[PDB]
Structure 1
Amino acid sequence: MVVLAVLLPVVFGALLLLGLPRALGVLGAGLSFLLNLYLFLTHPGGVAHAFQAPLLPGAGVYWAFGLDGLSALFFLTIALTVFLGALVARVEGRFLGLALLMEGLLLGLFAARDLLVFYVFFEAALIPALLMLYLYGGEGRTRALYTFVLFTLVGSLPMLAAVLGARLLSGSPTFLLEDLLAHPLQEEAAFWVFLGFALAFAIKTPLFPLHAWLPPFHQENHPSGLADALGTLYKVGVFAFFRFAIPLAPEGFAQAQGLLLFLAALSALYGAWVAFAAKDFKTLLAYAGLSHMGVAALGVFSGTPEGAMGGLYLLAASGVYTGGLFLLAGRLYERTGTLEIGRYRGLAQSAPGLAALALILFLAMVGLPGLSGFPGEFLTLLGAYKASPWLAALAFLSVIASAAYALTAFQKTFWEEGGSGVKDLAGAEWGFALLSVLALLLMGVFPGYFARGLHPLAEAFAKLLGG
């Protein structure tokens, strides 16, 4: 059931960490992918694979899991992305076990059916990040590590007071999301709880003033970008917003809606705009991820189930293709040795299908219709315009900068005058690009099949803001 798929990447990452060899990670990620796909199919509803086990009877803690429409496809997305990062990695530092551990942690994070288990995974996801950052790459590794870790922790620890207030002030007997949702929080008490939630979730969203931890994180990881891909998967902020933040304290969200929508708009614009000024791949991709998170948070905060479903779909797909771009930059490093955009121009003539892979990925990034980005982008646009037209319009002065930075990077990296000549593709990279394009096309052209579980949650939690 759910716990099996949640733990499989954890146990495989352990067996790669202490045990040998690297190859165990490829087959482990494949087994995870197949299990998460099987869980994604035949999904009846939320209780699909429900798990309930007691841990602290007195304190009220229970292992609580289940596959919602959201948990299923996010499991599938994570399994797929980490499998891709597992085959193509080329890190081979024997630490892909850390990548599988982080995968399993993010799985448990998403599948949490009770508040405290979610909080536990939210705090646990910090350790592998600092680990694969510190000992596996980067010159400013220590400083970026401290910055990112301290930001996450300064956000997270007061959220413990927030969750303690949310449980105690509501008289909810347990930490179960069912029970906690059964007992609402009052005015000027849901206010403070939501404020403590919004700090920890915005600094991890990321929004504009709280994003300063993102570029240093992405720069000094392993140059291959496996750690970077998993950190982009670590932008789970929006998710916690929609399921936990807003439904548990909409009274404060009433005053905070405009502020948060504005932050999402300006964050998206700022990221997609600065990404033009980026002189390296890590900076560009970090600012792009910031823009996408701004869009997703905008869609969720706008109410308007259109916007919410768009935000979540865009979140999953952006995680997928941003992780793909990170791994691609790492592979081009391993074959070349640099991530600068100006140098190494002739790539296109030497790289037959790596050019096409990078192009498909950047197209999915700028949100091209037919690929994964556009459904979420447009649904979020609709929902935001429903909520507040002004911030939606400003926020979508982003596709312009999206095309600008993506095309500039692609052109000056591949198109221009022939250089020395570069390796074409590796055998693992073949399956990588094939599966990447397959998933992108399937998620972009057929958004009907995916995200069907997202519609009920969207409309229910959007009507919840009403009477």
Structure 2
Amino acid sequence: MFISVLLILFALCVTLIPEAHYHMVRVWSFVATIIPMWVVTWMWWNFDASGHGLQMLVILGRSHLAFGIDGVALSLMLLTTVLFPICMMLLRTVAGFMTFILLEVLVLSALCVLDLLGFYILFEASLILLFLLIGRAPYGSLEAAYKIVLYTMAGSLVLLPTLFMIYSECGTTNVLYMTCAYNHQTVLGWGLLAVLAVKIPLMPVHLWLPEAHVAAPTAGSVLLAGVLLKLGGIGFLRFMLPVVPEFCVSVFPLVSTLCLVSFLFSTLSTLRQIDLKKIVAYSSIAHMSMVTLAIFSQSEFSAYSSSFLMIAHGLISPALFLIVGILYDRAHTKFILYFSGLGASMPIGSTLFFLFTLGNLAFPLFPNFIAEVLCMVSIFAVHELLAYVFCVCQVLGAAYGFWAFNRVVHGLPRGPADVTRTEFHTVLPLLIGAVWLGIKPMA
């Protein structure tokens, strides 16, 4: 807590640096995100895996805002602290540095909060930052920014009275006493489903993602894909399943059909896309549908497998966004028809593209393979057909993945030259994390 105050105050000192010292501004904003990565690694060192489920607790009196660490929050916090310095390497202005610093404060505090009102306050305080990040004046899109902000606001406004309903019902929004009291679970369950089915892209409230994740800059796309979608999953695992479990059983056919149609229809839409960033953007919806069904199965080790799929997606899809961002930065287009023969002109970039293509399709020696196997073990244990639907549709994911790769990488060599040292080192931590988590993830 004292450490967190010191890290925030060190991060906020970027504004006071005079702008004529360019080197100092770059180094200060990069170190301001490097330090929380070290602190979260130390928190992993301090964790007792044979101890209590909630460790390193702190509660700030009668102000809500109570905090604690479990395994899902700790893995997601480690992933966020990895992803934020890479975002710092892709920005050039103090406005970008400050927006991403404020976003990192809000994400890190939202991932480990234990109060529902605290979760509401901390998460969607990032709405105006996302609006300004997506609708930036010369190269953004105001339509996309309006869509993402309005969908998130709609879901949050459905949740807010139900939050206050359980608060008047039992006397607290602390999740440890909300899980032990008697509450009207249908109303609160519908409010929580309303927020987290927009955060996780679940059809029909999913149309904001294709616009926002493409109109964003490369750093914004890395953040939005790798981090902000998983707040819906940790919302399911931390707040909704412990507090309204009767609802979570009774809504299972509806959540199940939403997940199945989201998976199938989003995979079918990904095949007709002609923009590389839109191809990468749609593929995330099917993965999150598998995550949601694995969470809702509650069957074998469902929290473990679903968290592991969230980590595998958060490693693999930001790297695909990084490669598309390199192509866009040095060729000024994201259109497939302008790219051919990238193997001959960018051999290192095409090799990285192929490896992350194989990772996104859940091939072995990548963490997505272990993730999808364990998620389908959790789904299979409820019924065999709910697993069969995901199993037989694997040709549809590989079709779009290999079609996009084969169209842009082979053929007549036209396009930009190979990657620089900076682009390679933006990609590199994700590759090392993927090789480790896909070969020896546990000990």
Normalising by the residue count of structure 2, what TM-score does the alignment of the two structures yield? Answer: 0.91
**C-alpha displacement at 1:12, in angstroms?**
6.1
Q: 1:215 aligns with which of 205, 210, 220?
A: 210
* Deviation by residue 1:32-52 (Cα, 9 ceiling, x = unmatched): 222222212231154432211
Give the equivalent residue in structure 1 for 2:22: none
Choose from 39, 51, 58 the match for 1:51. 58
Gaps of 5+ in 2: 20-24
Is contact 2:72–2:234 with CA below 8 Å preserved after alignment? no
2:224 aligns with one of 220, 231, 247: 231
Give runs of aligned pairs for residues 345-424 of structure 1, distance below 5 A. 345-419=340-414, 421-424=415-418
Deviation at 1:322, TM superposition (A): 1.4
Q: Which amino acid aligns with 1:70?
A: V
Provide the residue aligned with 2:178 in structure 1.
Answer: 180
Shift of 1:13: 5.6
Q: Provide, for residues 38-74 of structure 1, a one-character-per-residue CA deviation record: whole Å limited to 9, x for no partner.
A: 21223115443221112xx3xxx33211221112111
- Distance in 2 separating the partners of 1:66 and 1:347: 47
CA displacement at 1:7 relative to structure 2: 7.7
**After the TM superposition, which of the residue ranges 174-183 and 365-374 deviates more from structure 2?**
174-183
CA contact (8 A) 1:203 1:211 kept: yes
Match of 2:82 in 1: 80
Give how far 1:16 is off.
4.1
Question: 2: CA distance between counterparts of 1:365 and 1:322?
Answer: 7
Q: Sort the Cα spacing of 1:346 and 1:15 in 2 relative to 1 into closer, same or farther, 3 A.
A: farther
**Paired residue secondary structure (1:182):** coil
1:58-73 equivalent positions in 2, closer than 5 A: 61-73=63-75
Q: Secondary structure at the match of 1:50?
A: strand
Q: Distance in 1 between matches of 2:283 and 2:10?
A: 31
Corresponding residue SS for 1:277: coil
Per-residue deviation, 1:93: 6.8
Residue 438 of structure 1 deviates from its aligned partner by 0.4
Q: Distance in 1 between matches of 2:103 and 2:281?
A: 19
- 2:152 partner amino acid: T
Q: Which residues in structure 2 correspond to 1:9-408 (within 5 Å)?
A: 11=9, 14-16=12-14, 19=17, 20=19, 21-44=25-48, 45-54=52-61, 57=62, 61-87=63-89, 89=90, 92=93, 94-135=95-136, 138=139, 141-169=141-169, 171=170, 173-185=171-183, 189-222=184-217, 225-232=218-225, 233-235=227-229, 236-408=231-403
- Over 3 Å counting, the alpha-carbon distance change for 1:144 and 1:408 in structure 2 is same
Q: Is the 8 A contact 1:267 1:291 kept in 2?
A: yes
Distance of 2:87 and 2:393 partners within structure 1: 28
- Structure having the higher helix fraction is 2
Unaligned runs of 5+ in 1: 450-467
Q: Does 1:442 align with 2:443?
A: no
Percent identity, aligned pairs only? Answer: 25
Shift of 1:205: 1.3
Q: Which of 432, 437, 454 does residue 426 from structure 2 map onto?
A: 432
Highest RCO, 1 vs 2 (Cα 8 Å, sep ≥ 6): 1
Shift in Å, 1:5: 5.3
The 2-side partners of 1:6 and 1:396 are apart by 47
Q: Is the 8 A contact 2:136 2:142 kept in 1?
A: no
Q: CA deviation at 1:210?
A: 0.9
Alignment CA distance shift 1:83-1:106 (3 Å)? same
Report if the CA contact (8 A) 1:335-1:422 is conserved: yes
Aligned-pair CA distance for 1:423: 2.2
Q: Structure 2 vs 1, CA of residues 18 and 334 (structure 1 numbering), >3 Å: closer, same or farther? A: farther
Query: Which one-letter code corresponds to 1:175 in the other structure?
Result: T
Q: CA deviation at 1:396?
A: 3.6
How has the CA–CA distance of structure 1 residues 14 and 285 changed in structure 2, closer, same or farther, with 3 Å as cutoff? farther
Tell me if structure 1 keeps the 8 A contact 2:15–2:94: no
Contact 2:276 2:334 in 1 (8 A): yes
CA distance in 2, matches of 1:305, 1:24: 46
TM-score (norm 1): 0.87
In structure 1, C-alpha distance between the alignment counterparts of 2:322 and 2:342, rounded to whole Å: 17
**Deviations 1:143-198 (CA, angstroms, capped at 9, x unpaired):** 221211111011001211111122322x2x4322212222242xxx2011101111
- Compared CA separation, residues 102 and 181, structure 1 to 2 (3 A): same
- How big is each residue's C-alpha offset from its partner over 1:197-228, in whole Å with a ceiling of 9 and x where there is no partner? 11111122111111111111122222xx2112
Matched AA of 2:174 = L
Deviation at 1:11, TM superposition (A): 4.9
Please give the alpha-carbon distance, in whole angstroms, between the structure 1 residues aligned to 2:390 and 2:349. 31
CA distance in 1, matches of 2:368, 2:212: 24
Q: Give the Cα–Cα distance (whole angstroms) in 2 for the partners of residues 308 and 239 of structure 1.
A: 10
SS of corresponding position for 2:145:
helix
